[PDB]
From a paper:
Glutathione transferases (GSTs) constitute a widespread superfamily of enzymes notably involved in detoxification processes and/or in specialized metabolism. PCC 6803, SynGSTC1, a chi-class GST (GSTC), is thought to participate in the detoxification process of methylglyoxal, a toxic by-product of cellular metabolism. GSTCs were shorter of about 30 residues compared to most cytosolic GSTs and had a well-conserved SRAS motif in the active site (10SRAS13 in SynGSTC1). The crystal structure of SynGSTC1 in complex with glutathione adopted the canonical GST fold with a very open active site because the α4 and α5 helices were exceptionally short.
PCC 6803 (SynGSTC1) in complex with GSH is presented. SynGSTC1 crystallized in space group P43212 with two polypeptide chains in the asymmetric unit. The SynGSTC1 protomer adopted the conserved GST fold that was subdivided into two domains for clarity (N-terminal domain β1α1β2α2β3β4α3 and C-terminal domain α4α5α6α7α8). The α4–α5 hairpin pattern was significantly shortened (roughly 10 residues) and the angle between these two helices (~42°) was twice that usually observed. This “missing” region made the active site of SynGSTC1 very open, with no clear pocket for the hydrophobic substrate (H-site). The active site contained GSH tightly bound to the G-site by numerous polar interactions (respectively, six, two and three for the γ-Glu, Cys and Gly moieties). The GSH Cys moiety adopted two rotamers (m, χ1 = −52° and t, χ1 = 172°) exposing the GSH thiol group towards the solvent.
Numbering used by the authors:
A (entry chain B), B (entry chain A): 1 to 183
Write the structure that this text describes.
Amino acid sequence: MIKLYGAPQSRASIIQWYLEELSLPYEFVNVNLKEGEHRQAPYLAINPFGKVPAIADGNFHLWESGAILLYLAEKASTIPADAQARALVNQWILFANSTLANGLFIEAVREKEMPRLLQSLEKILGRSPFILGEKFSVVDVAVGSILAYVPIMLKLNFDDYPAVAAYVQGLVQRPAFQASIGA
Amino acid sequence: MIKLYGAPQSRASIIQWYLEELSLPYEFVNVNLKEGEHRQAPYLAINPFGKVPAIADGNFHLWESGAILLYLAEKASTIPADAQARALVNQWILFANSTLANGLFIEAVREKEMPRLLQSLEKILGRSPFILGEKFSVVDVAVGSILAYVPIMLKLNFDDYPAVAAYVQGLVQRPAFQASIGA
Ligand SMILES: N[C@@H](CCC(=O)N[C@@H](CS)C(=O)NCC(=O)O)C(=O)O
Ligand SMILES: N[C@@H](CCC(=O)N[C@@H](CS)C(=O)NCC(=O)O)C(=O)O
């Protein structure tokens, strides 16, 4: 089965949320970051940059939370996808991992970037329940996890963005979220 | 041909580098960021977050430099790839856009992150000429572009990382790099 390498209150929880959504079994392997386990040869053979999360699926190893989400989404897919359908999913995962996370969590750029990001998301989320339309997808795990960390880590709220606020509330109340990030 | 939306001294040059490596033509369209053209309705209809680069491939539009690189790499592949082969490339593109760029360019984390990132890259690059092995790939465009920007923006060098220094020197001398980032 999939082995997920993670640590307490790390991005491995985002992978656990998607595994809960997909109803897939997995082994959780704790990596003791406080004691430097991630900086030793055994973990560096899984991720040479010593970061969690990572997965092992047999002899295959993979790191970067965004690449793990895309991999799990592809493996679970029932209808074959083309380069354009994968590209739109990749776009949102890259956005969550760079443009969005940076604009919200980098103090030097937050005042300018955060309102613009949320204003753009408000327009999108006001027209459809999920980022890609009527159906929940891996994009909502990627983008939604970053947004859900705003109240948790910055003590900020989405009161000025009602569609964003309702979207994040809807994700937080999903049983799969409550069994992972929300636990 | 692909339309590439870019701006002076921006990440659109990374896409232009890869298009030149693939010997593909493209129609370059400047977006005047200094005059707020990226915040006007025509550009917001391409990228709702008002960032360059973006591409149009016929009626298909795509934003996030990393997603564009993955899309062009998929489109230019002659041998069909499975989820694991795509995942390894996705891993490096996410790394370049998050872990690597943040660890090098965010002042508050640079002291701890930068030597760790460079030491890991030094070990990989000391064993093979390119990140994935013997052959140059889209991963070298993604990672190499970020590393090439280190001397320019931070006034730092790779004197203590000789394989990183020789790898970057090699990339900067490539004709496709000179026709794009080096132009
Ligand atoms: N872009 C990476 C970031 C991973 C990351 O920063 N992981 C942290 C924990 S949340 C880590 O392993 N830190 C250990 C260290 O930097 O020494 C991803 O999304 O997977
Ligand atoms: N993660 C994005 C970042 C894109 C980005 O930051 N682009 C800048 C280039 S200057 C931009 O368009 N800035 C305009 C703005 O932020 O208003 C990518 O890699 O494409």
